Design a binder for these strands. Structure first.
Ligand SMILES: [Mg+2]
Ligand SMILES: [Mg+2]
Ligand SMILES: [Mg+2]
Ligand SMILES: [Mg+2]
Ligand SMILES: [Mg+2]
Ligand SMILES: [Mg+2]
Ligand SMILES: [Mg+2]
Ligand SMILES: [Mg+2]
Ligand SMILES: [Mg+2]
Ligand SMILES: [Mg+2]
Ligand SMILES: [Mg+2]
Ligand SMILES: [Mg+2]
Ligand SMILES: [Mg+2]
Ligand SMILES: [Mg+2]
Ligand SMILES: [Mg+2]
Ligand SMILES: [Mg+2]
Ligand SMILES: [Mg+2]
Ligand SMILES: [Mg+2]
Ligand SMILES: [Mg+2]
Ligand SMILES: [Mg+2]
Ligand SMILES: [Mg+2]
Lengths: 64, 50, 79, 76, 71
RNA sequence: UUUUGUAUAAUGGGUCAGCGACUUAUAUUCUGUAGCAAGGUUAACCGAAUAGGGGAGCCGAAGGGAAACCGAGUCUUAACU
RNA sequence: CUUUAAUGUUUGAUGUUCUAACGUUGACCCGUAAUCCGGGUUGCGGACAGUGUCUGGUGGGUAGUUUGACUGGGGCGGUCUCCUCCUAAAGAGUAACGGAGGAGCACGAAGGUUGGCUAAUCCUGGUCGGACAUCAGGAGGUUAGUGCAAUGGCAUAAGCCAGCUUGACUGCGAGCGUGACGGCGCGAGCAGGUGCGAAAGCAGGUCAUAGUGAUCCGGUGGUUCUGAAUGGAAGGGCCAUC
């Protein structure tokens, strides 16, 4: 049987040119008024997954 | 807590608004300031809204 | 509250409503005393004490609006 | 027992010491008050943190009529 | 939609490049409707692209060999 | 065997002989080795059939962006030194 | 067009009457040599009762489960996130049901500039007035003050007093600090507009450190980015926000 991908993860990480994964920053969904504009704008661009958590992601998306 | 969120709608007709907290009890008067509107790229007057 | 009739008929219904609300208030007060005594009682061994009962008592601590201005005799300082 | 709570450590202190070559913008000291005042070629943030304003060498000095410690960056 | 390498234009047909003549040489999928020619390979022959969306960089390379890009 | 730690008065075993526990499809990643090499390889199936056909298809040679889209660049942005 | 006053007239409700649906665990006859069942006459009810679908109430009668952790054994008691000091051994970090205190905010000015000013306490004199109110001059030297705990700061004031004000701006960001990660913090400088000042300049909130909550699901504005034959639309996506 082919490995079933974790469908939740395929909605949050996208592969890149070299082999790293790109994800979206958290803390940008709701009650933001207390957050400084500097903090809001620094979370807008998409980030890349760190070193420690890379192992747990390749497990979830074998085919991606 | 007695300060409740308000939004400062713009006055250039575009859809753009800031948000802040205002004491609706001791300041019943509405706010209006001069803020930047990045749609028309000008310093226009921002009036108080819902 | 919509009432169909005249002022004289509606005034009695208004008074009845106030009397019933005061009676229900007193009943709720007495219930709160009775449950507070049980909350403050002991434990009697290694037994329950009823977390569900505690939650019910905590829920029973609600609030109601006293009639905003049942204003009474004003003040006039003679000179 | 009533007490028994505490706050996370804020990790303040001197991050770069004397004679250390820094790059522009690097933090020199994380501060609560102003124990170290801003000399030439350094800044002062809202958190009273002293950040480098030009790459060089860190130099602690005691200039001033009240003997208050100053940090300034030599240009190298 | 599918990419097209520049080098792939040498395996197509007697000169014309088109959606049907691209997929008749197993360069693109059968159900690929749109395509775009990319500066990735090298060409020498005078290929005439029938209808496609060759880029700005690759257009200056097709005509260099002697091609023609019409619609 | 389990433990910080056992001659331990902690566990197991009366003794011999026979049996008794990391395996098997499929899929994916890495390593070694072998074949070809900007190419590599077939599946079902056909077949006097471990040959030979079958290139449907899969991976790779191009990336960026949520997407249209652009393209060795792209996204952000009114625009980037 | 206005009030109503009538007779027709459709519908709705509340009733009374009837017989033909339906009930009969009333009587008689037949199948039949059968207190079952069926059929036929005859009464008694009768559009009720009863059953089917939908629906509100009740329902431990029955069934499926839940009922946290730390803990000088468990239970009872206390506690669970954030800030300040000490323990903490002169970098950073460092435990216990160790020793002491706070937070779940506030402010369209208590924010930004430009001007100006500098406290607590004590003494002498003086109308009501004293131990202490306001005035005068001497010692004084921060024992003062900070919007709210404590520590570190503050005279160039970060404390006090006024003018004009909205930078409590939009897009970015060299480079660093701290985290296992999620994340959090500091930031010169660049571009577009802006306030204060004669300018040099300062301003991307408040002397700093607490004043908080991921994801999912959904709500409200903007944007043809997408739109399942095509044109639209619904629904998604992106930005702002709840
Ligand atoms: Mg959103
Ligand atoms: Mg093919
Ligand atoms: Mg061991
Ligand atoms: Mg033991
Ligand atoms: Mg021994
Ligand atoms: Mg033994
Ligand atoms: Mg023995
Ligand atoms: Mg045992
Ligand atoms: Mg034994
Ligand atoms: Mg691509
Ligand atoms: Mg039960
Ligand atoms: Mg079960
Ligand atoms: Mg326990
Ligand atoms: Mg030490
Ligand atoms: Mg230390
Ligand atoms: Mg202030
Ligand atoms: Mg000043
Ligand atoms: Mg100030
Ligand atoms: Mg403060
Ligand atoms: Mg359509
Ligand atoms: Mg939408």
């Amino acid at each position: 049987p082919k490995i079933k991908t974790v469908r939740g993860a395929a909605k949050r990480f996208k592969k890149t040119g070299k082999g790293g994964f790109k994800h979206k920053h958290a803390n940008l969904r709701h009650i933001l008024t207390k957050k400084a504009t500097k903090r809001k704008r620094h979370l807008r661009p998409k980030a890349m997954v760190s070193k420690g958590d890379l192992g747990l992601v390749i497990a979830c998306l074998p085919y991606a | 807590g007695i300060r409740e969120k308000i939004k400062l709608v713009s006055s250039a007709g575009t859809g753009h608004f800031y948000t802040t907290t205002k004491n609706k009890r001791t300041k019943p008067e509405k706010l209006e300031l001069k803020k930047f509107d990045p749609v028309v790229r000008q310093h226009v007057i921002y009036k108080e809204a819902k | 509250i919509p009432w169909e009739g005249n002022y004289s008929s509606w005034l009695e219904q208004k008074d009845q409503r106030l009397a019933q609300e005061a009676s229900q208030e007193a009943a709720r007060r007495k219930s709160i005393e009775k449950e507070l005594e049980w909350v403050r009682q002991g434990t009697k061994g290694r037994q329950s004490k009823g977390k569900a009962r505690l939650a019910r008592f905590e829920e029973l601590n609600s609030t109601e609006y006293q009639k905003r201005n049942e204003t009474n005799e004003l003040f006039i300082p003679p000179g | 027992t009533r007490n028994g709570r505490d706050s996370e450590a804020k990790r303040l202190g001197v991050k770069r010491f004397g004679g250390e070559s820094v790059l522009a913008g690097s933090i020199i000291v994380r501060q609560r008050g102003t124990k170290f005042h801003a000399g030439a070629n350094v800044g002062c943030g809202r958190d009273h943190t002293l950040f480098a304003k030009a790459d060089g060498k860190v130099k602690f000095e005691v200039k001033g009529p009240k003997n208050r410690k100053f940090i300034s960056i030599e240009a190298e | 939609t599918a990419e097209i390498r520049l080098s792939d234009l040498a395996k197509v047909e007697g000169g014309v490049v088109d959606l049907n003549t691209l997929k008749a040489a197993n360069i693109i999928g059968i159900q690929i409707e749109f395509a775009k020619v990319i500066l990735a390979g090298e060409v020498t022959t005078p290929v005439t692209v029938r209808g496609l969306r060759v880029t700005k960089g690759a257009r200056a390379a097709i005509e260099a060999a002697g091609g023609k890009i019409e619609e």
